[PDB]
Enzyme design. Structure first.
Site, mmCIF file in Angstrom:
data_model
loop_
_atom_site.group_PDB
_atom_site.id
_atom_site.type_symbol
_atom_site.label_atom_id
_atom_site.label_comp_id
_atom_site.label_asym_id
_atom_site.label_seq_id
_atom_site.Cartn_x
_atom_site.Cartn_y
_atom_site.Cartn_z
ATOM 1 N N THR A 11 32.723 -9.751 -50.768
ATOM 2 C CA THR A 11 32.140 -11.087 -50.774
ATOM 3 C C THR A 11 32.671 -11.945 -51.913
ATOM 4 O O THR A 11 32.270 -13.110 -52.038
ATOM 5 C CB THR A 11 30.615 -11.063 -50.876
ATOM 6 N N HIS A 61 26.766 -4.220 -59.468
ATOM 7 C CA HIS A 61 26.610 -5.576 -59.991
ATOM 8 C C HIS A 61 25.575 -6.289 -59.132
ATOM 9 O O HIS A 61 25.083 -5.738 -58.148
ATOM 10 C CB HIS A 61 27.930 -6.349 -59.943
ATOM 11 N N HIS A 120 24.596 -4.722 -55.488
ATOM 12 C CA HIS A 120 25.700 -4.079 -54.774
ATOM 13 C C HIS A 120 26.175 -2.862 -55.546
ATOM 14 O O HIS A 120 26.631 -3.013 -56.690
ATOM 15 C CB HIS A 120 26.860 -5.048 -54.584
ATOM 16 N N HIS A 159 24.074 -10.312 -57.535
ATOM 17 C CA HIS A 159 24.182 -11.736 -57.225
ATOM 18 C C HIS A 159 22.773 -12.311 -57.301
ATOM 19 O O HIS A 159 21.839 -11.645 -56.862
ATOM 20 C CB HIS A 159 24.738 -11.944 -55.814
ATOM 21 N N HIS A 202 32.323 -12.966 -62.642
ATOM 22 C CA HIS A 202 31.576 -13.337 -61.436
ATOM 23 C C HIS A 202 30.169 -12.678 -61.377
ATOM 24 O O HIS A 202 29.377 -12.833 -60.453
ATOM 25 C CB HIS A 202 32.401 -13.036 -60.141
ATOM 26 N N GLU A 246 23.066 -12.570 -50.937
ATOM 27 C CA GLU A 246 24.225 -12.850 -50.115
ATOM 28 C C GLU A 246 23.894 -12.612 -48.652
ATOM 29 O O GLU A 246 23.943 -13.537 -47.843
ATOM 30 C CB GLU A 246 25.400 -12.003 -50.612
HETATM 31 N N1 LIG Z 1 30.469 -8.424 -53.913
HETATM 32 S S1 LIG Z 1 31.379 -7.239 -53.537
HETATM 33 O O1 LIG Z 1 31.853 -7.371 -52.161
HETATM 34 O O2 LIG Z 1 30.756 -5.976 -53.837
HETATM 35 C C1 LIG Z 1 32.878 -7.286 -54.479
HETATM 36 C C2 LIG Z 1 32.681 -6.782 -55.876
HETATM 37 C C3 LIG Z 1 33.943 -6.940 -56.728
HETATM 38 C C4 LIG Z 1 35.085 -5.916 -56.584
HETATM 39 B B1 LIG Z 1 36.143 -6.166 -55.322
HETATM 40 B B2 LIG Z 1 36.896 -4.623 -54.994
HETATM 41 B B3 LIG Z 1 37.744 -4.146 -56.466
HETATM 42 B B4 LIG Z 1 37.756 -5.816 -55.992
HETATM 43 B B5 LIG Z 1 37.534 -5.399 -57.712
HETATM 44 B B6 LIG Z 1 36.579 -3.939 -57.766
HETATM 45 B B7 LIG Z 1 36.123 -3.437 -56.097
HETATM 46 B B8 LIG Z 1 35.158 -4.676 -55.358
HETATM 47 B B9 LIG Z 1 34.939 -4.238 -57.055
HETATM 48 C C5 LIG Z 1 35.844 -5.432 -57.974
HETATM 49 B B10 LIG Z 1 36.602 -6.640 -56.965
HETATM 50 ZN ZN LIG Z 2 28.706 -8.114 -54.726
#
Ligand SMILES: [N]S(=O)(=O)[C][C][C][C+2]1234B567B89%10B%11%12%13B85%14B%1158B%12%11%15B%139%12B%1061B%12%112[C+]5%153B%14874
Ligand SMILES: [Zn+2]
Length: 257
Positions: free
Chosen positions: A195, A91, A116, A93, A61, A103
């Site tokens: 997100t 990361h 982010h 977007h 993503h 976003e």
């Molecule tokens: N755009 S954002 O909300 O920063 C989500 C980023 C991806 C993630 B979510 B939580 B755990 B889950 B896994 B890890 B942590 B956040 B990073 C990756 B995914």
């Molecule tokens: Zn993000």
């Protein structure tokens, strides 16, 4: 299954992740005239001196730079937060053209991209536990506009050719994320969500008012990434942003007048 296309993008996500229609979804439009200055908000404490980057990864993503989060080496504190949040990864977007990609929006303005920096609350011990809590994560969001190059981004740009397609990673040690930050730590904050799927409502958002500038050549290299794996039909990794979601019963607070 999920992605950013017509048949698997943001308008579809609620089928696998019904919280997509929840009460504290992200991103949102930041209406600057409605956000209230809150003199009780603290300066944000960003302590990245001892950060240890590990790897850079395309996951189909975004691309991410991952950090050692096994100790308090790169931590976010203060601001709206109580306690200590460890940096896990950053990361971005971004868009297919410079007029979209962020976003969050500011008075409906879209930036070319959004950075982010994802942090989790050490009181929950690991990120998987943290995503199950309303104060589990703190994401620091930084807007990117196109103009002058950001020197501290170039190390990232220059390795993206090595992680073109989904599933590819590379060593990415000794990267200093302080080189991605704007001068001011003026911010807006509100309670929200991831997100991307699983869209968990676990995030205190901290969105900096001051964008960083990146060059057209830098963002062009983001746009050469592929959503697809090697051997599959080539689909440029662009427009990997979720649109603004309803604010519902939330207040956006400003750290500044
Ligand atoms: N755009 S954002 O909300 O920063 C989500 C980023 C991806 C993630 B979510 B939580 B755990 B889950 B896994 B890890 B942590 B956040 B990073 C990756 B995914
Ligand atoms: Zn993000």
């Amino acid at each position: 299954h999920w992605g950013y296309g017509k048949h698997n993008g943001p308008e579809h996500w609620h089928k696998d992740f019904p919280i997509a229609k929840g009460e504290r979804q992200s991103p949102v439009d930041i209406d600057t005239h409605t956000a209230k200055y809150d003199p009780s908000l603290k300066p944000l404490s960003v302590s990245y001196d001892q950060a240890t980057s590990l790897r850079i990864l395309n996951n189909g993503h975004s691309f991410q730079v991952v950090f050692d989060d096994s100790q308090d080496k790169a931590v976010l504190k203060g601001g709206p937060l109580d306690g200590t949040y460890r940096l896990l990864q950053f990361h971005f977007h971004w868009g297919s053209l410079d007029g979209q990609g962020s976003e969050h929006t500011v008075d409906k303005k879209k930036y070319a991209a959004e950075l982010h920096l994802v942090h989790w609350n050490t009181k929950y011990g690991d990120v998987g536990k943290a995503v199950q809590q309303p104060d589990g994560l703190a994401v620091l969001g930084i807007f990117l506009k196109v103009g002058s190059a950001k020197p501290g981004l170039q190390k990232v740009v220059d390795v993206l050719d090595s992680i073109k397609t989904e599933g590819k990673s590379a060593d990415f040690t000794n990267f200093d994320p302080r080189g991605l930050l704007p001068e001011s730590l003026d911010y807006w904050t509100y309670p929200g969500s991831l997100t991307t799927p699983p869209l968990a409502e676990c995030v205190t958002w901290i969105v900096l008012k001051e964008p960083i500038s990146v060059s057209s050549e830098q963002v062009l290299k983001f746009r050469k990434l592929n959503f697809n794996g090697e051997g599959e039909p080539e689909e440029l990794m662009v427009d990997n942003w979720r649109p603004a979601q309803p604010l519902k019963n939330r207040q956006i607070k400003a750290s500044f007048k």
